[model samples]
Target: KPVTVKLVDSQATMETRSLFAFMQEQRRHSIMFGHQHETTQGLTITRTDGTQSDTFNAVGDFAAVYGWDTLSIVAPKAEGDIVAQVKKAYARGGIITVSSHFDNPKTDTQKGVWPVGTSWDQTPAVVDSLPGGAYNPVLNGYLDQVAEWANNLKDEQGRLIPVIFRLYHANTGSWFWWGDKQSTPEQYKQLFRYSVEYLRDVKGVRNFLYAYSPNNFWDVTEANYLERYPGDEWVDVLGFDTYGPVADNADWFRNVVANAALVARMAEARGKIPVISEIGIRAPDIEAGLYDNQWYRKLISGLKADPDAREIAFLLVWRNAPQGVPGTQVPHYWVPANRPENINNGTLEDFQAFYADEFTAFNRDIEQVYQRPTLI
Candidate 1:
């Protein structure tokens, strides 16, 4: 039976009060998803006393808790040994979301880092050299890879894994070599449009969700966010990476909600899922410790307060890596953490809370309140 996850009905005062109380506000049944990007190479959970577990086992545990019938097993420079791992998630009912980087070598000709245009102007030279003319041909290959990889995926009854393949998103930002930061926005638009055509026309992929996500820069202005959106027809999901601190600034979260609601409301006029694709909170003090737990509380609380904005389906948090110090420009790498002394914290507990009950409540509230479809 379909589960109808619903939030407790309360007055405006109660709703506002519950949000601050860090209450769960789920009002509809929806998929709850989250992930840790850095764990594939490591055998242990973050802050778990360095205990070792097979990558498959770890990912499985995460899927069960994150309310995910799907998970992202994205690789860094090298493709993760997730063939076996992804199969594991399929057993329990989960999909996989994978992306190809700008200079993946297997497909990308530009061997560079993110925001490549922001950092350097050589992104085009990189995309131009890929297997194809650095355009849709290369990106088209990405979809092919995902389809090929997922073909053998099995369910408990034995079945194929559903795939969610996304190309270099947020093309406006020059992080990857294929992005359009160095060139005209049209360059980005063409690359993006071609990717859609190739995925749908050539690959003939159906058991998939096509997502278009841009950076928080779009939050700076609605025009920026909607700049490269492929319109309702081309997109299956509208997502954004709401990076940085969300708790301290309620407006940031509100605007993001408003933006997502507006997009979904439009899509709902036709019926579509509006999602917050990626999100995370970097601890202010890298040295303070992932153990603080207070930051997690604050972020979750603030998200609960907003009511007019609840069209989200999936919220993926950027997991904290053990090596990085908080407040660093990039926390994924090894850096000094503030509270190295306090270890073995409840990172697992925090994640479990999100995927299981709390997130369910949050999604329900949005769905029940905004059941009527809005115009796209």
Candidate 2:
């Protein structure tokens, strides 16, 4: 058997854990799926058979929440609710990975937008404005909020639930404030290291496992990928996020799988875990029917065909849209729950086939994830 790597969800809560464990036990295997919802209350799933009925359960293996506007816990609930959700995920043996879409400290827009023609040369000023700088409440406050959430997370047994904290993700992209366009390699590394040190050393939060991820594997070389790396000691997971067409594009699949292989190899060499932090076709593409129906199955086949890619701990796709919007008239990114009321991006049959694949591990297939042995 291939070495087991635990599957994880971002911002998973107690309800999700309870829901997923039961789903796995019922389905006879876990579906390593991740989703992003505004609230932690409810999750709806359709039967794999495309039956007429739908199951509204509070279960999901992964909760893909974001810390975008405010650098705090991604949940949209009260602190108590957030804490309860963390405990629930732990009790049910679910993994929680928090993705940080941290806003630019220099710009206070609800959306992160640096001035036009922004370049790496302007990063030093921004770097100097972060924590450990003269005085930047924005940076300090953001980290402070994150620290608070980390320090407060506990299981019902009162033990800290280890969290995979993904910071400054998609750094290679130019979209986010901390992307490569906004900061130099050295500056980004400084930001990463400082955040870790502040949380671990300064704030005394020890239950966090740091993750380093770029947008895509465009930089096919290890040196290029790690240019902004904060070092192995400061990171526990080596991850990357990639999205593309799944129609007849064998090259896209090959490139991503190749990248996963490289990442897996380097991670093994350094005694760290390999992860696909985030990946999914853009919403518009799904709505436009740009992908083939066998996309899910093909993705699994391509990943496992390569030994290195198959060894990854977990591969998480992006979230599906809210239940009923009626805005887009295309297939959604998720496996179709077959809800007639919604635009199902993925087909139920394809998803079911993907779920049944030997290489795919649903919640039911997982055996002792939280307690699993790890090199880090």
Candidate 1 residue-wise lDDT at 190: 61
lDDT of 2 at 261: 85
**For candidate 1, what is the TM-score?**
0.63
Q: Candidate 2 regions off by >4 Å?
A: 1-33, 37-81, 109-125, 131-135, 287-291, 323-333, 340-346, 372-376
lDDT of 2 by residue, 1-376 (tens): 1132222332233332333233223222222444333223222543222111121122223332211112235322222234554455455455666776544466443333534212221333346556566535666666777888877777666656667788887788767667777678888888888777777777777566678888667558888788888787677778898888756667787878888888888876875677677766656676765656666777788888787777676667654444433554444544444443333544555656776677666444555554322220
TM-score of each: 0.63, 0.75
Residue-level lDDT tens digits of model 1 in 1-376: 1222121111112211222112122313343443434234232444232122222232233432121211232223243355554555433333345544433322243435543322133345434533365354544444566554444444455544444445556556665554555446655556666665655556554344556776656345546666676665565556666655523555565556566555545545533445566665534533343333343444445444554234455566543354443354324411112232322444444433443444443221232221222211
Worst 10 residues of 2 by lDDT: 48-57
Candidate 1, residue 169: Cα displacement in angstroms equals 1.8
Error of 1 at 315 (Å): 0.5
